[PDB]
Design a binder for this molecule. Structure first.
Ligand SMILES: [O-]S([O-])([O-])O[C@H](CO)[C@H](O)C[Se@+]1C[C@@H](O)[C@H](O)[C@H]1CO
Ligand SMILES: *[C@H]1O[C@H](CO)[C@@H](O)[C@H](O)[C@H]1NC(C)=O
Ligand SMILES: [Zn+2]
Length: 1014
């Protein structure tokens, strides 16, 4: 195994280093506005060294953006595909690449058999070529790597089954900035090449000058280079035709033949395209070939890529004709005019890369190596696209919830083979596709029109319901005596209980367990743990009486705590934000202990009075002018007081101090240790009154944030033996700090209401001497070192915070883990900040055509980990990566993959068992079974189950290792007859494994295995 901490990779271009050196000056470079006037030596190309040009027709089809997926399909895409089939069939030399499989699959299943056959033939013969082959072209900033893999697998599995092809070249022309998580996943999925486009204009300029636009992109910690994937970065401002033929858009626009008038398009540079003819072909060719040769100067081989397309292009037959005919005339003239020394033709993306590597192999060029990422993107001036790291935060949080439900549903149902009548495969396929669709770069990014966001939400809601149905049927079969199990596949044996989604104050959706001497004395509940190690976590349920005790199925008492159900209200009468306690329902909390990838059953029983093993939390409402807060049967009276500083300690955990406004002020790790200053504060960013306005994409603040005026907020303190918390009703946010014995959990119920042109940020202030350094993660896969650069504007120092961020000095580290992707930064030494929501009245001119005024309450969740790191073995100062500690990693897992909770729906569960998976191996803490998916239907004689195993890298800080058993996923199911290592998509077998044993992977590595069973 490579050491990912101590050896600094030696690469030609290291993005953090390049950023530190670059000046980012935005000067007018001439017709190539962000570059310079390219000059070339006409003698470079000649009879023995020609410029091979590949013109690649393409059509960018967004699976939802300003129209929903289905509206685009009906109005545009089905026509584009229908006409592509006809035109390619009839013009053998014409080519076309396709990226979005969600649309292709939608089209293909609507085709008659005759057309399906014609389609397969033009794919088989190379005319229509799939690039990437994912369900969508995902966002690369907010997306979790697990969902990036999920959508890639969904599209590629469909392609393998129906088109018999697996793309090895990726095409990503629209994500707003790019992540190294893509080549990581792609290189482990059989890919050989990839192309990206939206990178900062200054980076394009810099790499172009060095001819470093094509590079072997390896991971930041990869010393050897085995993760390397050849990458081509386009050089210009857009993927449209005016910005793809060469440096001068006024000339290139003249070669987009759909802009002559009848199509309602024109050239903004004021020179229109002109139909190519025998009398103008020489002059048109001279202009075009000159653009081509200039573009060629920015690359190292004599093979040139010329994309030819734009949004939803190649729709009308007349469009296909006008583009094809004119280009055929240009090619015939250019290729027969020896003096140009050019051979041009229509080509596919793979054809381009194949020719590039043939040149490389002929010793024509050597490519530089590169590590790093391409955030935060700016397409021009100071227009940095960091706004979308936060836009539509409700759905960004929903993404993570569904992510986990999909994994749990596929894992829980994987244990058995199911009869087709159970509709398990059907429900899982729908859930995977709706979550996959939302990975689109106008989906999770929050950059779509209001009605389209609603469509994605409705789709995800159905996906959540599908996961629940599958999960609950699976639990029932897994925990019921086999000879008693009698399933009704449409029946709800269990109801899922989720305490954080939609969340208290967002939707009153949780069911109350109703017990009573005259109706039902007890209720079974079951917890599922998708992680491959034994796990304990507190779980809570609503019950109709405070006198409830908990036992496991061996009838052993389980210590429990009951607290009130508190809801916050904006009292329009008193003009205050305060809590009201339920008088009919209460929260019971207890520690669940669950096997690796298993289930554990508990029983809640009502009693006449206080049960022996249940304690009750005290509650204290701090505010001036208090009024009574009755709680029905709750046995402890609420206390009142004037606002004041307070301190709390649960178990042996840290002791936290809060200001009289209910916000954290300090953390004390142990009884002896000091009270380390850690202050939470909420602020607001505004919008500029002159110049460019912030929108769904752009963050253009009118300067540093201003503190939110807090007034004298109401603060609620609940103190319990198992869980305590401090909650405060601030303007736009009910902020909560929850303590359970370890790092606190933070929850923000964010309702930006009608606060127009406002962005709410949550900031942490400490004395940590971090200077200008901070760390943020990429797709929940790795942490990359960031350096705040004052030579760039504030918005440029904002980065995606998909799951975590931290700052540290030689001795102390503060890590903030998130349950949703949001944007954030460290704008001053000792600080961390992350945006909660943003409401913008204006459009930011990137095509959306609207601002963001559809905000809705959202419950953001976090874990805040303060730790001493002076004893930790960390990477050297020049290493571009950072790594989490064991506690921070566990804390992230508690947010993204919590225990799932199920309430038995009927009165009695006959045949109930207390546990499943007690014999599953409890793997080392840095290892996870990211995916467990049965790959065969029940009629398959040989059953196959796929596993994706990921090993992160945790810092060694002096804590002895201990125990843990080897996890061999190939032996998790009985009767194994074969074990194979495969690509991450499970589509290609890479290794037949001896003894049918799946070995574990190395730190930061990810592998897939498929076990076959008789
Ligand atoms: O013309 S336009 O206003 O629709 O926008 C252009 C071309 O200028 C874009 O490239 C459309 Se790109 C389509 C969509 O997925 C992105 O959100 C858009 C971000 O800008
Ligand atoms: C297509 O995949 C392979 C690769 O060319 C080919 O040999 C085979 O005939 C096709 N697969 C099937 C099952 O039709
Ligand atoms: Zn797009």
């Amino acid at each position: 195994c490579q050491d990912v901490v101590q050896d600094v990779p030696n690469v030609d271009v290291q993005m953090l280093e390049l950023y530190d050196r670059m000046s980012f000056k935005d000067i007018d470079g001439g017709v190539w506005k962000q570059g310079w006037n390219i000059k070339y030596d006409p003698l470079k190309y000649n009879a023995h060294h020609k410029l091979k040009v590949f013109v690649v027709p393409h059509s960018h089809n967004d699976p939802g953006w300003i129209q929903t997926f289905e509206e685009y399909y009906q109005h545009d895409t089905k026509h584009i595909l229908s006409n592509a089939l006809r035109h390619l069939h009839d013009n053998p030399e014409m080519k076309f690449i396709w990226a979005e499989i969600s649309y292709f699959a939608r089209f293909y299943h609507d085709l008659g058999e005759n057309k399906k056959l014609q389609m397969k033939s033009i794919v088989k013969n190379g005319q229509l070529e799939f690039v990437t082959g994912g369900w969508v072209m995902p966002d690369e900033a907010n997306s979790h790597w697990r969902n990036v893999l999920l959508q890639l697998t969904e599209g590629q599995t469909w392609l393998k089954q129906f088109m018999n092809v697996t793309p090895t070249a990726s095409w990503a022309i629209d994500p707003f900035g790019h992540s190294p998580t893509m080549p990581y996943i792609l290189q482990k999925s059989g890919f050989k090449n990839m192309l990206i486009q939206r990178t900062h204009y200054s980076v394009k300029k810099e790499l172009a000058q060095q001819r470093q636009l094509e590079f072997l992109w390896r991971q930041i910690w990869d010393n050897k280079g085995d993760t390397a994937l050849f990458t081509h970065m386009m050089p210009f401002y857009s993927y449209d035709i005016p910005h793809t033929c060469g440096p001068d858009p006024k000339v290139c626009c003249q070669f987009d033949f759909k802009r002559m008038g009848s199509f309602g398009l024109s050239c903004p540079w004021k020179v229109p395209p002109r139909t190519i003819s025998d009398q103008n072909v020489a002059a048109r060719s001279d202009l075009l070939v000159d653009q081509w040769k200039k573009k060629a100067e920015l690359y190292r081989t004599n093979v040139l890529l010329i994309p030819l397309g734009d949004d939803f292009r190649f729709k009308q037959n007349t469009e296909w004709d006008v583009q094809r005919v004119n280009y055929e005339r240009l090619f015939e003239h250019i290729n027969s005019q020896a003096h140009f020394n050019v051979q041009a033709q229509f080509g596919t993306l793979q054809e381009y890369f194949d020719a590039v590597h043939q040149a490389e192999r002929a010793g024509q060029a050597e490519f530089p190596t590169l590590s790093g990422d391409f955030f935060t993107y700016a397409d021009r001036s100071d227009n940095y696209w960091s706004g979308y790291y936060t836009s539509r935060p409700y759905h960004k949080r929903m993404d993570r919830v569904l992510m986990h439900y999909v994994r749990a549903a596929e894992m829980l149902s994987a244990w058995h083979s199911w009869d087709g009548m159970a509709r398990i495969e059907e429900r899982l396929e729908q859930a995977r596709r709706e979550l996959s669709l939302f990975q689109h770069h106008d989906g999770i990014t929050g950059t779509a029109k209001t009605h389209v966001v609603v469509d994605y939400e409705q789709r995800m809601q159905e996906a959540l319901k599908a996961c629940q149905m599958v999960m609950q049927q699976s639990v029932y079969r897994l925990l019921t005596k086999p000879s008693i199990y009698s399933p009704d596949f449409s029946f709800s044996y269990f109801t899922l209980d989720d305490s954080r989604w939609p969340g208290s104050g967002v939707e009153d959706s949780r069911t109350t367990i109703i017990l009573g001497e005259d109706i039902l004395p007890s209720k079974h509940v079951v917890m599922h743990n998708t992680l491959p190690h034994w796990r304990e976590q507190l779980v809570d349920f609503y019950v109709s009486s405070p006198f409830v005790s908990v036992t496991d199925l061996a009838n052993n008492p389980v210590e429990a705590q009951v607290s009130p159900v508190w809801s916050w209200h904006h009292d329009t009468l008193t003009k205050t934000i305060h809590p009201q306690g339920s008088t009919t329902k209460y929260r019971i909390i207890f520690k669940a202990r669950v096997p690796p990838m298993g289930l554990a059953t508990y029983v809640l029983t009502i009693s006449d009075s206080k049960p022996e093993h249940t304690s009750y939390a005290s509650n204290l409402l701090l505010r001036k002018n208090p009024t009574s807060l009755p709680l029905g049967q709750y046995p402890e009276d609420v206390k009142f007081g004037d606002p004041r500083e307070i301190s709390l300690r649960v178990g042996n955990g840290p002791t936290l101090a809060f200001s009289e406004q209910g916000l954290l002020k300090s953390i004390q790790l142990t009884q002896d240790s000091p009270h380390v200053p850690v202050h939470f504060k909420f602020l607001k960013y505004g919008v500029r009154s002159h110049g460019d306005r912030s929108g769904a994409y752009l963050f253009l603040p009118n300067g540093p944030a201003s503190p939110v005026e807090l007034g004298q907020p109401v603060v609620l303190v609940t103190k319990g033996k198992l869980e305590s918390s401090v909650s405060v009703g601030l303007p736009s946010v009910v902020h909560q700090t929850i303590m359970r014995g370890g790092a606190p959990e933070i929850r923000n119920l964010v309702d930006i209401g009608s606060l127009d042109n406002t962005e709410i940020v949550m900031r942490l202030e400490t004395h940590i001497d971090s200077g200008d350094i901070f760390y943020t993660d990429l797709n929940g896969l790795q942490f990359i070192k960031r350096r705040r650069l004052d030579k760039l504007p504030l918005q440029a120092n904002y980065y995606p915070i998909p799951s975590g961020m931290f700052i540290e000095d030689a001795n102390t580290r503060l890590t903030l883990l998130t349950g949703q992707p949001l944007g954030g930064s460290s704008l001053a030494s000792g600080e961390l900040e992350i945006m909660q929501d943003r409401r913008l009245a204006s459009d930011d001119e990137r095509g959306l055509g609207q601002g963001v005024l559809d905000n809705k309450p959202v419950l953001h969740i976090y874990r805040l980990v303060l730790e001493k790191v002076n004893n930790c073995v960390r990477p050297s100062k020049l290493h571009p990566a950072g790594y989490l500690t064991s506690a921070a990693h566990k804390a992230s897992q508690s947010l993204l993959d919590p225990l799932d909770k199920f309430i038995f729906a009927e009165n009695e569960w006959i045949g109930a068992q207390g546990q499943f998976g007690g014999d599953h191996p409890s793997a080392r803490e840095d290892l996870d079974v990211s995916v467990m998916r049965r790959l065969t239907k029940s009629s398959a004689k040989t059953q196959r189950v796929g596993y994706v195993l990921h090993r992160t890298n945790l810092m060694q800080c002096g804590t002895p290792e201990e125990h843990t058993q080897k996890l061999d996923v190939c032996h998790l199911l009985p009767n194994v007859a074969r074990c194979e290592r495969t690509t991450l998509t499970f589509l290609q077998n890479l290794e037949h494994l001896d003894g049918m044993v799946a070995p574990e992977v190395c730190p930061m590595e990810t592998a897939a295995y498929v076990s076959s069973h008789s």
